[PDB]
Amino acid sequence: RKVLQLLRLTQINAGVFVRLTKATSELIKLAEPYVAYGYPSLSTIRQLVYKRGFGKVNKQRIALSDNAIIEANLGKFNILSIEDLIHEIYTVGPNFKQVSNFLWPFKLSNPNGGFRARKFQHFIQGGDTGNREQFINALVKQMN
Amino acid sequence: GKSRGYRSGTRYAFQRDFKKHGAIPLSTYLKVYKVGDIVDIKANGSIQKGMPHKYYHGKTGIVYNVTKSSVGVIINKVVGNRYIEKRVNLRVEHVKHSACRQEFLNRVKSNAAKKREAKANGETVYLKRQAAKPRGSRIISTEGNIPQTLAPVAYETFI
Amino acid sequence: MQKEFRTSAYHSRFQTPFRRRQEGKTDYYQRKRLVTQHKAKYNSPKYRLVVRFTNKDIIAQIVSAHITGDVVFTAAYAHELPRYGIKYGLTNWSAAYAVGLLVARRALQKLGLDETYTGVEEVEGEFELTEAVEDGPRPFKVFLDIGLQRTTTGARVFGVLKGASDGGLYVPHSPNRFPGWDIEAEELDAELLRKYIFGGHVAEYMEELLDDDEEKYKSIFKNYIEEEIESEDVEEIYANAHEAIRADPSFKPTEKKFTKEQYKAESKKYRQQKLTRAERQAKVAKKIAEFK
Amino acid sequence: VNVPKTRKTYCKGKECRKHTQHKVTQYKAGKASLFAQGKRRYDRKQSGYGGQTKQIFHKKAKTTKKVVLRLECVVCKTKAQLPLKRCKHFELGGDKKQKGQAL
Amino acid sequence: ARRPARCYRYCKNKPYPKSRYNRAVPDAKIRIYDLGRKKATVDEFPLCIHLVSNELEQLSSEALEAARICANKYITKVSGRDSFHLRVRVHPFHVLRINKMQGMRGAWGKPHGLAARVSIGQIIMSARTKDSNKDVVIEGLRRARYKFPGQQKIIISKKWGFTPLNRDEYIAKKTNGEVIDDGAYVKFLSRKGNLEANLQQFPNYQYS
RNA sequence: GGCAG
RNA sequence: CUGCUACCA
RNA sequence: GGUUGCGGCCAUAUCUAGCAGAAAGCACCGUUCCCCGUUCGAUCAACCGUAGUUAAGCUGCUAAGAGCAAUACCGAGUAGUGUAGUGGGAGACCAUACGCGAAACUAUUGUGCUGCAAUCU
RNA sequence: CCUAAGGGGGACUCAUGGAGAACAGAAAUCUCCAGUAGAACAAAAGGGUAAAAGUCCCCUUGAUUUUGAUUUUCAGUGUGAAUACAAACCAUGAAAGUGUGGCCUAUCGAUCCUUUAGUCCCUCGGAAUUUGAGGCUAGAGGUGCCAGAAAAGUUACCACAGGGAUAACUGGCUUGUGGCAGUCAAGCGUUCAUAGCGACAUUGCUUUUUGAUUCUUCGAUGUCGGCUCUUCCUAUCAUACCGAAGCAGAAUUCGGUAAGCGUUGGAUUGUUCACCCACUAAUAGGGAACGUGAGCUGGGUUUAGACCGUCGUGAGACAGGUUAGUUU
RNA sequence: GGGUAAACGGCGGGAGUAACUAUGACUCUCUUAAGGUAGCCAAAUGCCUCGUCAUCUAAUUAGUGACGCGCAUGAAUGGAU
RNA sequence: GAGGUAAAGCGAAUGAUUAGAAGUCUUGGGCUUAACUUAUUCUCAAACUUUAAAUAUGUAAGAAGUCCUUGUUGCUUAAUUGAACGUGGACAAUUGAAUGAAGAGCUUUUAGUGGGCCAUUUUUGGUAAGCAGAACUGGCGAUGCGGGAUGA
Ligand SMILES: [Mg+2]
Ligand SMILES: [Mg+2]
Ligand SMILES: [Mg+2]
Ligand SMILES: [Mg+2]
Ligand SMILES: [Mg+2]
Ligand SMILES: [Mg+2]
Ligand SMILES: [Mg+2]
Ligand SMILES: [Mg+2]
Ligand SMILES: [Mg+2]
Ligand SMILES: [Mg+2]
Ligand SMILES: [Mg+2]
Ligand SMILES: [Mg+2]
Ligand SMILES: [Mg+2]
Ligand SMILES: [Mg+2]
Ligand SMILES: [Mg+2]
Ligand SMILES: [Mg+2]
Ligand SMILES: [Mg+2]
Ligand SMILES: [Mg+2]
Ligand SMILES: [Mg+2]
Ligand SMILES: [Mg+2]
Ligand SMILES: [Mg+2]
Ligand SMILES: [Mg+2]
Ligand SMILES: [Mg+2]
Ligand SMILES: [Mg+2]
Ligand SMILES: [Mg+2]
Ligand SMILES: [Mg+2]
Ligand SMILES: [Mg+2]
Ligand SMILES: [Mg+2]
Ligand SMILES: [Mg+2]
Ligand SMILES: [Mg+2]
Ligand SMILES: [Mg+2]
Ligand SMILES: [Mg+2]
Ligand SMILES: [Mg+2]
Ligand SMILES: [Mg+2]
Ligand SMILES: [Mg+2]
Ligand SMILES: [Mg+2]
Ligand SMILES: [Mg+2]
Ligand SMILES: [Mg+2]
Ligand SMILES: [Mg+2]
Ligand SMILES: [Mg+2]
Ligand SMILES: [Mg+2]
Ligand SMILES: [Mg+2]
Ligand SMILES: [Mg+2]
Ligand SMILES: [Mg+2]
Ligand SMILES: [Mg+2]
Ligand SMILES: [Mg+2]
Ligand SMILES: [Mg+2]
Ligand SMILES: [Mg+2]
Ligand SMILES: [Mg+2]
Ligand SMILES: [Mg+2]
Ligand SMILES: [Mg+2]
Ligand SMILES: [Mg+2]
Ligand SMILES: [Mg+2]
Ligand SMILES: [Mg+2]
Ligand SMILES: [Mg+2]
Ligand SMILES: [Mg+2]
Ligand SMILES: [Mg+2]
Ligand SMILES: [Mg+2]
Ligand SMILES: [Mg+2]
Ligand SMILES: [Mg+2]
Ligand SMILES: [Zn+2]
């Protein structure tokens, strides 16, 4: 529960970008029975940021509808555009921490087409939790 | 009848190590403790004076007082919903310097040396420690190492 | 019929003592009491006067203990005494006194406390402790470490004690173990103590033996006979030696007839070398073959 | 418990302020006076009608008492008090133990 | 007297052996664990057949005794008392307790019986015999199986008799002079220790 | 805890 | 050591 | 490099059975007037270094040595275990998923290192 | 419990085994060797200890004085116990040191009152002296229900507030126990394991026994038995049809489908249970709130009267006997 | 210290034996005293117990008559009639 | 850093325990049995153990830090040694791991409560129990909604 809170996953169908290290991998292992995660493609990142991209501005959830919003909050980190933000996420950049924390947790819908018959078992065993590794893109296409 | 005496349940905790009973080697009495030193607490069963209570067996704290044969150690103990500062008097047989100080103090020295040398060479250096990162790409040569195919083995009884 | 005792389990569970306790050389109880220092006197060391007697030598060392091992401050041996004029009786109580005086004077020269804390310049055998001088450094404090040697009134270790005390070192002690202490009437006979300091007992043995058993006098006191040293001039040998020791207590190492490398090369010739693993395997194979 | 009839402990007397020789005696509680204020109050309360006006202890449990040594300094006659642990038998200056003998 | 074994079938309690803490414990019904020709040499009985537990379970000493008697009777009747060596490989060391022999107050029981705590795959009974006596020894164990609760398997061992060596490694070590008799068991050669004593104890040792 | 045989 | 008498922690 | 005194770690140093040991040291060794202690100058004390000896102590070496220590495509990713399922099974229990992971065993290697002072063929 | 079994110092090494020595032997005393503690350390158990913490010897009172800090239990209150220092004064040892009781973990006690020690200090209030009294600081006398009232019974004549937080029925879970049924097959059965049985073991079912529990009911579900009447179960006593036998017949025993149909009259007992007499095809076993009291009856139990025996000083008790006791 | 039970009340445990078998007529010692006498009884008093024997009946845990080491009958706490 | 539970071990200590074999009886009886001894063998421990996890648990990861120079004291040192606290100087945002942070810290005052119960896993007593008692977490109580027909 604490791990999911520290990942800012405090509701169902909340999504977040995590840079993989030993520390973050050991974090995600604790939350594994409750999450589905994987390796996102560039088009998946772009669709997420374009459709459901919001920034944390003065502790408020603000739509990323103009590059001035991104510049005013991430211009000191050389992020001047939505494509700069997408690039910084995709190629995990020197300012990944600031860019991903500026991004409000993505609030996805339920999958169009549903889950598997039973979610709460590992993807390897025919469920939905754990690491699915490239099928996160298909799942995100379903949910975004 | 319940028994909750001072040394209840310390049958194995306060035992000497196997083949390590008897006299205390004198480096224990030659170590020097200063106020502010971080020390581990480990009760020695053969010295019954100045012995810690079983709660402090295995705890690490700050030296605050130095007396003829003992040190005062500050421990933070959870009592309900907060911590309480405990002040324990321990003979030096039950005390050992904590090894975490020398490692952090070495990273401080190394950072100072690297920063000054990088300034001398006119470049920049990043001193923050990093967690282990996923490994990069690589090419595996198969000269002398052609892949060997394994299969699951049939069931056998070996009794 | 009875159980064999030295089993493999007996050896497995045996806890060997400390190396220097199994050698029968270190009393670790007494060593802990001597060495351990007040924890609020943080890195200030306690200084020990280690006094050890061999069959031929008196060893007196001023030692402080550290984690990597003991460190010698100064050391005086009885075989240095011939330089100062004492060639015979190198294990007297009086030779012990001279060695204690020598180590005291040498330590004080090394420290710089020569003019201050001279000591008892006129040895009359009275019990006395080195008192500090007001508005000056305190006397060098040293504690006596007699090791495994028994505490008896008249023992030679307290001769080294008395010599070092008169030499200016402050060494805490009591006079009830000196020769001449009357245990019934608890006072020290300083006349007999001065006799022992200046070889009076040895001179009295010379005088008493010469007129009773001349043959034994000839065998026991040969060196004195060929040196033409009588009893009446025995005392002066020490009285002069004392003075010379105070005149120049500095250590002069023996000039070495060979270098370190020459000593090592000579000694290495008489040192058997361990068999190689292959060598002992070949020996085993040969013994099997000759067993068929 | 056997305690010798003499003892050298610290004397708190202003003349002494040091270990002096003391004579040891067992403390014996003095007789309760009739003019102590609590005694006077109790007698007034008990007078008249009403019965017993205070409580009387019954449920005795101890089988021993704490022995108190009265140490009198032989120099200045200042007394000191020392309580000992609970002993069923206590003598002062008894015969000392003799180890190494048969029954 | 005795409750049905179902009351004590499962390893629900910690092991409760005889000790200085429980002393008035009765004796196990099984006292004999080796039957048949227990003095036979290793070379006489090469074939080993086991009765193996497929259960984590408790077996009473009464069941151990009954199965031992059943197997012994059948095998001695059909093939002779000296055609096999039967060994019971589980000893009942766990004390069962009975309460009734007030209410739930002070309900700590009294010793009632003894049981062996067996695991899955644990050998219960071993029978070393000749190869030609296989079907007999098997039927002796198959009858003994009825006296036990739970599932047991009859497994033909890969090894020579009661030795830990396979039936081929034993023959190799036998023709190489590395095995000597010790009565009913054997001693194996060691390449460690006193060379002379090792060579003397195994004279036919073809060293390599 | 006081007397007394 | 028996009897009688006495009982604020 | 040997040896002594004082040590640190406290068996890779211990134990058993053999063998060797130049120089110095150490040791055994000689004596009882004196200080001292004993049933016993055996231990302890003192005296000579003079009469003798490396016999022992001590040191090193030897042993498919016992023990100890270390290591490991040894066993074994086994036993155990954190987490999971509306998994199996009447149950006892078991399998699978994401993780952590022994002990015994087996084999090989080793058998004190070292600080201060003094001394020595 | 201990003037040492406390404190200091010193010397020595223990249990046990082997080999030897007059009486002397398995066990007396002497000697050597081995001996990691296999001994001992007041008392439970655990830990600790080998030039010691054990044994013996020498000297001693640190088991002393002053008042703070800390640890455990903990509210971070008290009590108990313990720890490390400060300031004294001592003991011991050549000394370094060690010693603020017992090698460590248990071995103990508030307010009020009394009593003693200390300071000989403060007060007795119109002012004094001397007695007396009261204060201040530290012990002791004790509360073991041990944070600490001053305390005998009975009630079957009984009362009240409540309680299904809790017993005495049914019901529910369980099934040890009770009952019933299997599996294996050592034996029994002239031979012959299995016609009929069946030990040592082992798997079950049942809720017709009794326990275990305490979930429901204490602003009340009428607590024994019998009589009466209906229905249901089957683990079938009889009756129908059959299979098996150590089935010649007759009788009997084992078994299958079967609850369609029946399963009694009496002596004694309140009885359920039991036990006899007799008839019968047979006189099977159970359930339905241990069916059934606005269906009865009221013999028993279980209000109040009374008697006895044992028990109690007694009032009274008895799950012992006895007699009389409103059934809406 | 003495008296007193038609005062309250009490009235027991222990140790051996007869020319088949069975039984035991056959003595002292303790509890603070005496140790249940004459009688009566499975009685409204007996647990075991529906005691045993006889009688009564076809059959009787009922009744009566016997028996009595009587859990725990008994003499104005009145016994037996 | 600490630990002694799971596992493991018993030809390792303690305690328990099955079977032979070879020796000694010289301090057992009638070739024999039984003792011991030696090397082996089967099987065990909540109040056994050499070893020894997983989970859980103590501390640290800087600016109140590190380094350099030299002031005070009645403490401490033979000391010009230290101890503690200081004056002065250098090291600047990669000020020295991650992730998160509807901010942190502090105070006063007062309510109800002090019958609990259930599920997974660990676990004690009991034959067991919709039984009695503990550990961690999550729940019901205090909670509706969709599913398990019905049901804290
Ligand atoms: Mg659709
Ligand atoms: Mg679904
Ligand atoms: Mg430990
Ligand atoms: Mg103590
Ligand atoms: Mg000493
Ligand atoms: Mg009144
Ligand atoms: Mg009056
Ligand atoms: Mg249990
Ligand atoms: Mg003691
Ligand atoms: Mg003593
Ligand atoms: Mg001693
Ligand atoms: Mg407290
Ligand atoms: Mg307290
Ligand atoms: Mg002193
Ligand atoms: Mg002190
Ligand atoms: Mg008062
Ligand atoms: Mg007045
Ligand atoms: Mg008190
Ligand atoms: Mg109370
Ligand atoms: Mg209380
Ligand atoms: Mg009343
Ligand atoms: Mg009543
Ligand atoms: Mg209830
Ligand atoms: Mg049943
Ligand atoms: Mg049954
Ligand atoms: Mg109920
Ligand atoms: Mg009710
Ligand atoms: Mg009603
Ligand atoms: Mg009704
Ligand atoms: Mg049927
Ligand atoms: Mg039929
Ligand atoms: Mg009914
Ligand atoms: Mg009705
Ligand atoms: Mg009615
Ligand atoms: Mg009725
Ligand atoms: Mg009535
Ligand atoms: Mg009437
Ligand atoms: Mg009636
Ligand atoms: Mg009636
Ligand atoms: Mg009678
Ligand atoms: Mg009569
Ligand atoms: Mg009668
Ligand atoms: Mg009659
Ligand atoms: Mg009657
Ligand atoms: Mg009748
Ligand atoms: Mg009638
Ligand atoms: Mg009659
Ligand atoms: Mg009567
Ligand atoms: Mg009567
Ligand atoms: Mg434990
Ligand atoms: Mg285990
Ligand atoms: Mg193990
Ligand atoms: Mg064992
Ligand atoms: Mg309130
Ligand atoms: Mg409250
Ligand atoms: Mg309440
Ligand atoms: Mg509620
Ligand atoms: Mg809910
Ligand atoms: Mg619903
Ligand atoms: Mg359902
Ligand atoms: Zn005085």
Tab-separated table of C-alpha atoms (C1' of nucleotides) in Angstrom, chain C residues 5-6 10 14-15 17 21 24 26-27 29 33-34 46 143 146 148 150-151 172-174 176-177, chain I residues 9-12 15 17-18 34-38 50-53 85-86 93-98:
chain	number	residue	atom	x	y	z
C	5	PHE	CA	39.708	-40.128	25.400
C	6	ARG	CA	41.492	-38.229	22.614
C	10	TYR	CA	37.501	-34.026	21.719
C	14	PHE	CA	38.684	-28.218	22.239
C	15	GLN	CA	39.111	-24.451	22.633
C	17	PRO	CA	43.879	-20.919	25.062
C	21	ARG	CA	48.926	-18.311	27.764
C	24	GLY	CA	52.907	-20.005	29.885
C	26	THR	CA	51.370	-14.005	29.815
C	27	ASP	CA	49.006	-13.750	32.774
C	29	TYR	CA	44.182	-11.387	34.218
C	33	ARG	CA	44.426	-4.934	35.225
C	34	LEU	CA	47.814	-3.372	34.401
C	46	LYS	CA	49.853	3.591	31.008
C	143	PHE	CA	53.825	0.690	37.162
C	146	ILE	CA	56.664	-8.661	37.471
C	148	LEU	CA	54.522	-14.668	36.597
C	150	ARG	CA	56.132	-14.591	42.817
C	151	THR	CA	55.901	-11.712	45.281
C	172	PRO	CA	54.179	3.559	43.386
C	173	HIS	CA	55.209	0.891	45.872
C	174	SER	CA	55.438	-0.075	49.531
C	176	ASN	CA	57.155	-4.346	52.939
C	177	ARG	CA	58.672	-6.528	50.204
I	9	G	C1'	45.340	-10.414	47.465
I	10	G	C1'	48.008	-14.945	46.821
I	11	A	C1'	48.799	-20.046	45.865
I	12	C	C1'	46.716	-24.253	43.659
I	15	A	C1'	34.888	-34.643	37.824
I	17	G	C1'	40.056	-42.973	34.241
I	18	G	C1'	44.658	-45.863	34.015
I	34	A	C1'	45.947	-38.609	31.239
I	35	G	C1'	42.140	-35.298	32.046
I	36	U	C1'	38.117	-28.094	27.835
I	37	A	C1'	35.737	-28.750	32.909
I	38	G	C1'	32.582	-34.322	31.587
I	50	A	C1'	40.521	-22.710	34.666
I	51	A	C1'	47.655	-19.265	36.505
I	52	A	C1'	39.253	-18.394	38.032
I	53	A	C1'	34.177	-16.787	39.540
I	85	C	C1'	29.614	8.203	37.965
I	86	A	C1'	30.484	12.637	41.676
I	93	G	C1'	47.589	-5.666	47.263
I	94	A	C1'	54.558	-4.672	45.609
I	95	A	C1'	51.408	-2.357	42.268
I	96	A	C1'	48.188	-1.312	38.354
I	97	G	C1'	43.805	-1.885	40.282
I	98	U	C1'	39.602	-3.848	42.660
